[PDB]
From Swiss-Prot:
Keywords recorded for this protein, A-Z: Allergen, Antimicrobial, Bacteriolytic enzyme, Disulfide bond, Glycosidase, Hydrolase, Secreted, Signal
Comment field (misc): Lysozyme C is capable of both hydrolysis and transglycosylation; it also shows a slight esterase activity. It acts rapidly on both peptide-substituted and unsubstituted peptidoglycan, and slowly on chitin oligosaccharides.
A Pfam short name: Lys
Family under the similarity heading: Belongs to the glycosyl hydrolase 22 family.
Catalysed reactions, as listed in the record: Hydrolysis of (1->4)-beta-linkages between N-acetylmuramic acid and N-acetyl-D-glucosamine residues in a peptidoglycan and between N-acetyl-D-glucosamine residues in chitodextrins
Listed InterPro entries: Glyco_hydro_22 (IPR001916), Glyco_hydro_22_CS (IPR019799), Glyco_hydro_22_lys (IPR000974), Lysozyme-like_dom_sf (IPR023346)
Gene3D superfamilies xref list: 1.10.530.10
Xref: CDD domains: LYZ_C
Compartments, as annotated in UniProt: Secreted
Protein name per the record: Lysozyme C
Amino acid sequence: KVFGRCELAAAMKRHGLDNYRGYSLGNWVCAAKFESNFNTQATNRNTDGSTDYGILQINSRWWCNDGRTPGSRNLCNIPCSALLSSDITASVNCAKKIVSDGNGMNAWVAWRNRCKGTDVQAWIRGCRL
Ligand code: NA
């Protein structure tokens, strides 16, 4: 599923991500935009052989099981495929664990490089929320 900007903002708010760990909803929408362009089916293979999955490009090194990332963990206790669903519940639940891990939203390199410090409220501007 390719979400619309305001459609994803609403789904993220419904699942409790708005101001989760002090990150405003525009931060989450901005990260999803640059990680996946709002596509739940987004995948990206890393040089280390891990894979990033879903709207927030969650990595198999630590967070999900894909059966093909040697030495990896599954700290969200999900198959990585769950992160590609039209239903964002698994991505949101796993993102909450990731952003609690100590480095906040820096865990998402695209958020640090393209969202952090910017006017992220522009990402929810005009949305009925
Ligand atoms: Na894994």
